[PDB]
Amino acid sequence: TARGTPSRFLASVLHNGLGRYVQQLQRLSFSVSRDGASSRGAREFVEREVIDFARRNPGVVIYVNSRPCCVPRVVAEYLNGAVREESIHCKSVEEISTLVQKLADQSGLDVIRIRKPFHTDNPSIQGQWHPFTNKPTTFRGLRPREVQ
Amino acid sequence: VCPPLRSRAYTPPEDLQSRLESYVKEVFLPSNWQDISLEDSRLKFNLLAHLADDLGHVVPNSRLHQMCRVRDVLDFYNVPIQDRSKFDELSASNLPPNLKITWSY
Numbered sequence: 001t002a003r004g005t006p007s008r009f010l011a012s013v014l015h016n017g018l019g020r021y022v023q024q025l026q027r028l029s030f031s032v033s034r035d036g037a038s039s040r041g042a043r044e045f046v047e048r049e050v051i052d053f054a055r056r057n058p059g060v061v062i063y064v065n066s067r068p069c070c071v072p073r074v075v076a077e078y079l080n081g082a083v084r085e086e087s088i089h090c091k092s093v094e095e096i097s098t099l100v101q102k103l104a105d106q107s108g109l110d111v112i113r114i115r116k117p118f119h120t121d122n123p124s125i126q127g128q129w130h131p132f133t134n135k136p137t138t139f140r141g142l143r144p145r146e147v148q
Numbered sequence: 149v150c151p152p153l154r155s156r157a158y159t160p161p162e163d164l165q166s167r168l169e170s171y172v173k174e175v176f177l178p179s180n181w182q183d184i185s186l187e188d189s190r191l192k193f194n195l196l197a198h199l200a201d202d203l204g205h206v207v208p209n210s211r212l213h214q215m216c217r218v219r220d221v222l223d224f225y226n227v228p229i230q231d232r233s234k235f236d237e238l239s240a241s242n243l244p245p246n247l248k249i250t251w252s253y
Contacts (some may be wrong), residue, residue, distance in 0.1 A: 034253055046238070046249075052245035066235070067252035 007113040013080045016107070023059045023105040027077035028100065030088070031068030038089045041074035045088075047097040053097075074100065078108025120138055156231035158205040164226055171198050172218055183220040199225065 013024055033039040045062055054062050071089040088096050175194045185193040200206035209236050213219050235251045
């Protein structure tokens, strides 16, 4: 639930779209096993798709360890320092491809509840409403029931 | 004593048809030697054993029955087989500069 979970506001990393778009994913690390059915899909992904992904994403350094700890994994490191570890255990080639593309597309910001679907640093152009907008002024600034 | 292990890598020789027809003449003659039938066990054994000794690469038992003709033997022997591990097959495949593969086995 929202009340039992942290939240944040919609944001980019370094104003990621103002001047130029910088892909926030910078490192992928596939720990894959030579043997073991758990990493069969990872092995097929390394054989058939990792090269094409690498040449599609020149800004991402991709490592293939070929000796994992525990389950086969992909560790995605982002520019803002975020590290997201995704197990690729028993996933098919297409499942791993979609997961890796999702990691490439997303930023390093936490996948938690986002309070507002929008973020403006300049919410007002004509001036934020205050009680004295739309209130007429009076001669000599006389408040109500003032004698002079 | 165990001899050095025979590498399974095999590149078909350039003068393969000439060598094969020489061996066929040695074993068995008519025109279109490609279509000589190997239904005879003696002749098939002689031809295939000679080829295996010469080229260091024998027809496996699985493919042994489909060698019905010298044409089939030629087709089997003109297809390369490489024994390089998947590590080599990937590393020596023009990896993009941002892709790094390491093997700890």
